[PDB]
Amino acid sequence: ILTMLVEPDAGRATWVAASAYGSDNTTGSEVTGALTEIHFSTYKLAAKSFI
Amino acid sequence: ILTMLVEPDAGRATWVAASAYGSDNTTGSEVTGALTEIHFSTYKLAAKSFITDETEEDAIFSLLPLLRKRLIEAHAVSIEEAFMTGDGSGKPKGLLTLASEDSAKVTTEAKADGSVLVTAKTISKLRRKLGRHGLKLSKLVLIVSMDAYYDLLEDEEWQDVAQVGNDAVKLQGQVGRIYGLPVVVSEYFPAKAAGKEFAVIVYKDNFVMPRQRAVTVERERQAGKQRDAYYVTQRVNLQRYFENGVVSGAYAA
Amino acid sequence: SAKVTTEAKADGSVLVTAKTISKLRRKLGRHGLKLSKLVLIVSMDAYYDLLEDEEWQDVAQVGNDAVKLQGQVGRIYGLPVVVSEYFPAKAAGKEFAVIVYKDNFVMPRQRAVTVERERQAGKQRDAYYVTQRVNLQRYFENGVVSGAYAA
Amino acid sequence: NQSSSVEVSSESYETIFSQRIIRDLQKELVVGALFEELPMSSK
């Protein structure tokens, strides 16, 4: 088996109000992401004869 | 805030009678004028992300560049989405919202289910609502959704070579200029449904981007929890001079 | 779920036309906007039906490459045509064409084609063996659209 | 701003007034001067 990796999608930011210009909400929200993986394999094919 | 002055409208002269040559009425009437003003503002966009100092060791490869790139690309996605169809509550009013609130939302006969496609003639018919600014073609921008483009690719009026020059669809499979308007495809249009926009035409020179500070990255170390917070902020807005210069077409109700 | 059930009948009441083939690009979604990265494959019957297509007959309709002057179909809606004979038999609900995103597919392989010979003196026989190990896989779960005859 | 401990009195010290003057697109004049003159020195 061979395994690869898959990058996640895109996030987004937020628009803060003016009333929170001094508090701890002035940095808005948080963006998060996780990776993913895929797999590969093979099958066997054969044939024979006699003389 | 920033303020500029808008010059007033025009005036009229008078046709004096022939019996008023010997009186002060010979000199005519008065022309008065008063200036006005407009203002511009800005809005703040922010995002953050944390990375504890133990997941960095608790893995084989690094995870910081992914974090930073995700931050920046999320910021760009949000700003472009807001410019597309942001409302007015603390965020810039989107182009489609401007067109709708200016009564420039032309309700066409194309159907959202798929019974009737979107024809190039329908797209070109939107130029009427632009009024005086629609006469010039070098000063316009056309943007269509993905599904509008795919329905354009199957237009009965662009198939034959004899119908449309050398740019027939059958020979190319691609659509370039529609009625002289270059075609640009964007996927950030709203969901396809009844009464939803699928193409917009804007007067490019009428819109500006007020901006206070660019995208800035700040790094804070929170030793009390052993993390590495990152902060990204910017202040922008989308503003226009006058109350015209956009038209949007929508599916039928 | 990319099997598009088109209107072409499985007997011959309705033929397979160029519009049916070109309409499949929509179900490719974002991948369908670039023609240079696609491959079209049609069966025997599909190709013979295309040869009788009504919209490729005249010089006025389609340039100089009208069917009446050449008798074969080359580029169709910008897509080059490849004919393959291994499609299933013409029947209701079966397929006749496919478009694939070429770069989305890989062919993993462990060993090449190898031949080994064995001598069985007890039977006066020579046994020949040919073996190989391959497979067909894709990166992400999309990029393929197939059209099928009507039910 | 009115968020810090020290702020300014009135908005006029938070605003930039510009003398730049702008006008919209105006109508054009066509039949005003397309005919030919006829000078009269009498009534």
Numbering used by the authors:
A (entry chain F): 205 to 255
B (entry chain E): 205 to 457
C (entry chain F): 307 to 457
D (entry chain D): 162 to 204
Task: Copy the relevant paper text.
We present a composite map determined by electron cryo-microscopy (cryo-EM) at resolutions ranging between 2.9 Å to 4.9 Å of the entire T5-like phage particle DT57C, and atomic models comprising its core structural proteins. Our results provide a complete atomic structure of a T5-like phage, provide insights into the process of DNA ejection as well as a structural basis for the design of engineered phages and future mechanistic studies.
Furthermore, we could separate the particle population into pre-ejection (capsid filled with DNA) and post-ejection (empty capsid after DNA release) states and to reconstruct the related states of the portal complex and the tail tip individually at resolutions sufficient to build atomic models of each state, gaining insight into the conformational changes leading to DNA release. Using 2D classification, we identified a smaller population of phages (~20% of all particles), where their DNA had been ejected. Following a similar methodology as for the intact phages (representing the pre-ejection state), we obtained reconstructions of the different parts of these empty phages (corresponding to the post-ejection state). Consistent with structures of the closely related T5 phage, the T = 13 icosahedral capsid of mature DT57C was composed of two proteins, the major capsid protein (MCP) and the head decorating protein (DCP), and it had a diameter of 930 nm. The asymmetric unit comprises 13 copies of the MCP lacking the Δ-domain (the first 160 N-terminal residues, which is cleaved during the maturation process of the capsid). To further confirm that empty phages indeed correspond to a post-ejection state where both the DNA and the bulk of the TMP had been properly ejected through the tail, we compared tomograms of virions in three different states: empty virions with an intact capsid, filled virions with an intact capsid and empty virions with a broken capsid. The tomograms revealed that nearly all empty virions have an intact capsid.
